[PDB]
Amino acid sequence: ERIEQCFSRIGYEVAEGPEVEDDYHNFEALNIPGHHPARAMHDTFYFNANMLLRTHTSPVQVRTMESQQPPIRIVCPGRVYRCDSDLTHSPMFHQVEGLLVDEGVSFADLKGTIEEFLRAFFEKQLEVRFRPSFFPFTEPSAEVDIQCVICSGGWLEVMGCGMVHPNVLRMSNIDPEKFQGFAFGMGAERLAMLRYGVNDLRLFFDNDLRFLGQFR
Amino acid sequence: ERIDVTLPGRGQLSGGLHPVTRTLERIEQCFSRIGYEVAEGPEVEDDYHNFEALNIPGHHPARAMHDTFYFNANMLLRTHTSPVQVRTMESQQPPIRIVCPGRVYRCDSDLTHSPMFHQVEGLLVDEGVSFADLKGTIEEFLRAFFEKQLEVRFRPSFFPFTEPSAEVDIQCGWLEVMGCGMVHPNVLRMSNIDPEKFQGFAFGMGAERLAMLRYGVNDLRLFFDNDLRFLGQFR
Amino acid sequence: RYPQARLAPNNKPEARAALPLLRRLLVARGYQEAITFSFIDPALFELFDPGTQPLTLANPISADMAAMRSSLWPGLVKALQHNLNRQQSRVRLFESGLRFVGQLEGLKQEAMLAGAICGKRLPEGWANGRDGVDFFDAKADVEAVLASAGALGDFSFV
Amino acid sequence: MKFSEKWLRSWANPQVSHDELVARLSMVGLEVDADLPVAGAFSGVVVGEVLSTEQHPDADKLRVCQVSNGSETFQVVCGAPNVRAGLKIPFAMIGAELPDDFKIKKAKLRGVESFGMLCSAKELQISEENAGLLELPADAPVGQDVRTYLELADYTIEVGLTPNRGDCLSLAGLAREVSAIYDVPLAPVAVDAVAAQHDETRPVELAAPAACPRYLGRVIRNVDLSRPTPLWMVERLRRSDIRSIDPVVDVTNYVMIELGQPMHAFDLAEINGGVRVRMAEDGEKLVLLDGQEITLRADTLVIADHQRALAIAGVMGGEHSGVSDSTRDLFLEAAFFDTIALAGKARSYGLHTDSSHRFERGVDSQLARKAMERATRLILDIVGGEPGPIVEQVSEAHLPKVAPITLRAERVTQMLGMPLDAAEIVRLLQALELTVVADGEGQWSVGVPSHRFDISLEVDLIEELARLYGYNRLPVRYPQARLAPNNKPEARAALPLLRRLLVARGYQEAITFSFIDPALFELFDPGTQPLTLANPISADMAAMRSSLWPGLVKALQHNLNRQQSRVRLFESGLRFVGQLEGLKQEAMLAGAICGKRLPEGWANGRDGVDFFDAKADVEAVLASAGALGDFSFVPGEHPALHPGQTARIEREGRLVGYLGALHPELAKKLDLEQPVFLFELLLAEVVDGHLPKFRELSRFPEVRRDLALLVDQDVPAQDILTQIRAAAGEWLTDLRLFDVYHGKGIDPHRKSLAVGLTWQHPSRTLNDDEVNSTTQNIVTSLEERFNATLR
Ligand SMILES: COc1cccc(-c2cc(C(F)(F)F)[nH]n2)c1
């Protein structure tokens, strides 16, 4: 609710999609080739050769890009699934993904958006760090760090972002010469744990009333 | 053997909100979703904020006791939520994007008019604001509010605080629903905003009038009687 | 045209009980929302606020609309009896608005949330007890409001 | 990718401390995962040489040694089983400070004087080898500080590389970055060509040039594979997490880690008629060096001879073709394998090697020759032998070629939110070894070097610029937007609204797994085939839920077992209905309750929750958008619910959902002893409502009449209430069922329904005659439709 409010107040529309997705929307449309390791059964839950449980809410952003022409300002909260499960990782979790596609969007615009969102979210004028990273769907890309002012009980990685890849737009009929865009992703449980001081991620899916009752 | 029927459920059920409250919430939402901040101010105001700052001269008929409720020579009950927009302009420098819902008072009362009522006023002050920007804003607001792609008409009017100014009509052969205009240079100047660098637009609307159009309410007096037979209809 | 804006993500703090939130809570708790005139009869004002000089209007619309309210209670009670006289038994109302405390020099204009209840504790129904409302019914309503932002412990009823 | 900083600094030295370098690395896109010292701290330890050993005359486990530090001979008593004359060892002199505050002092061990100590790797925190003394190379410099000699003043930096930086999978790659980052000279290893000593070659055929456009081969005759890998190489490999196995593998690994070129050595005797670089035949069998017997596919590139496959190209060598103890001659290989042609191939056989990784990520297409010469020199140095000429087989047509990219300055300024100077742009791009030629005002033609496989577009160039400039040095702006006022329709019950309503109504919000146990699924949905996962995490998480109920019930009993009596939970989420072809993914709002109706309190009745408590909760939700009248609760049946206490919820005949008590048989099966009440609503049928349509308020009094109605115990109350409304005329303002009686005062198969009927005329007062008239028509209608009677 809190993540959505930060953006909906500034013109972002809440977009939803199906949890049972296809290879095109979940991978192909996002510049993830057929031979890419993310597609494997070691990371992705499958029903058959083409149908799966979505690994991210990125397919929702794809379905939006196909349906309409820019401007696009969307936030995509939802349940996502990953085959890699143990402590620190659950087979099901929640993440919010964002997308802004307009005529003159920059990496400076992205930095501004992310830095202000984190400040708004954590209710502090905290330091925000942008480290170069990689994603098939974005270029340039960054891993976003914040200080330990919200503890580990001197930086913490909280989210990722980047400028939408030209091929990602092109594939979804958006001219990369006319339109630029930025996208971002974050894990809801990671954020909740930082916010509320929750140590064990497994408390989120047990539904013990002694846990739940603490958030009244 | 332990069978039962489909009788009503046990206990308390929900009540509801007042139709004006529903209407104010709705008006605010149209703008808050696009960067407008909700601004509030006092209901007991001074002559400066309520009139002088809004380019209403001392000898102006609106100031008289036939229209304005007074406590003394300088203290009154606000005739509009415009003083809130003034207090905002004094406190900060542009950009300003605000909506000002609230209780307002007018001495003129009988049928079609109540001594107390609600209105929402808007203000946008930035570097390159135009009358085209204002038309766009108003037309899209009304469409959003009445949930229809209705025709919007702008008729030239007058206000001391705005120039140019317009009365805004919508179909159903037309109905006047709100007023607006480009903020007067003197209004900005008085509140330390340079009219050479900054332009702005403002708008005003009556909540009860809008609620009456939306819900089919005939008599404006139903709004302040609080008859449960009236209220219950907006659950 | 539609005006351009360099807008940044923002939000109010998480741990706060806003008035739109509280209104809906009271709705769910079986209350109807009333809006009453801010200026009341000086005699009514005196009944609820003995010894206080109201902030009185110089040109009131009528004499029974001359005093600025220092409580939403006279107005709520009046709306409650308006209904009682109109064949209503169970009247559960709430209002939010300003109170006017003091004379011009030192005047406090504070936002209040007030509520008034009467009649049976529950609506008339086959599954419902015919007990009349009491203090502890209103208490639960206040408790629910006071706990809306996870700070119920910060409050005490003395 | 792990490496020794000392070795990196020998190529490109940043002139900043370790801490500064490790910090910057992450800030330029090479995230450091670890930085550790190569050894423990100690002083006064030098290279010593054992001149003679003698048996200690008063302790058999000890030896009396004469040891030189290159300046003086000292008598040291030693108990290590490997201590012997000629041995080069770490000599800790008197005064030396060893780890864990161990100061070497003078000693008289069993009547014999000892002027120092000889050390093991363990004693010095070098390795965990305490088996004996750390035997140093025969040619070690006697007297030199052991930390100096063994390069112990060093750290191992580990980088978590991104798939686009395959070029950084070597010291050559990483040093090039450092040189760019810090604008410092790059000094790569000078690799002199090794001259052929003979003319023996083996032919090489490129049968698949599209998958291997370049292949280099070399004959190395009469190698002594009994010889050891030198310490410098073992240490360099170790500091990169490569364990020493054999001299030949160690060299091919060393060259790969040093330059980035994976290489392979074959036993020349195992090559029949020269090399053939070709695709495998379908079902071709090859035993790898690790013993794995792979059954190959026609899409897989192999290195073969004229008889059979020898290796799976660029991933792993075969057992037969590979070096053994009996090997006297070698055939060295350094080739370029196309990344596209190799992608996923190792994984498809369940394999992953340092070679497969580098080739998939990209190996500099021009590198093979420098690598070949380097590995030739190292092989001759380590195991001797005689090199023949290099056989280079190349396919010019299939070599990788990236077209030059035009970079526009305005596009850099736009993207970065600030302009960069032309000199700065050129300097940065040229440091990365890109070819920058000016192409008019604020435009360049840039060429991509052979080691870079991630650069093909203008945006990739801008990324490089941003990266090396510093992401955190870039400006901050908020995106512009032409925003118009907008809103969703007024008369709608959204899920955030409904959640808060349920909260206010005393519910706790649960979130359960979307995939459940197929056996649990079967309990709630008998006879339905769930949408089952092909690769579930466990077998009890194989079925996609068709209801939020199994999950809610399970969370409810989780709590019951945890000393909870009153459990009131709700969940919102998708249901999965049908198989892929026709699958419906609908959002649901479900709730589950048990225990006392009210929490424990002095003022609260101790009655337990029932159907009508859950009913009120559903009613409150269904009324959220002023459309309660649009819904009907009809007696229905559901397999998970009690058939005597189940309501089917409908809107215009369409199914909204169900409300009921959990079936006692299901409870038995789940070991649930308490009654549980469930509801589930299809959100699509709940969200729409109606906008208020004002109806004028009468100035006149209302009139009420009460009716006590005797009806058959089984006739539904809503059927009667509906008949009453139909027969009450136009002025009925309210109908209330205020009591139900099924007692002794009447027949055991009947029930009394006490109803209150209110009428109000909008324009006048109602008279008693007309009201009694209307009342009688209601009664008459109920007598004919239900054989009803007044009490
Ligand atoms: C950490 O997750 C992230 C980080 C950065 C970008 C994205 C992303 C990009 C897109 C799309 F559809 F526009 F291409 N969807 N999501 C996701």
Ligand SMILES: COc1cccc(-c2cc(C(F)(F)F)[nH]n2)c1
């Ligand atoms: C019908 O009400 C209206 C119509 C047009 C303009 C305005 C208005 C202008 C201002 C201020 F303070 F900014 F100058 N406040 N309100 C109000």
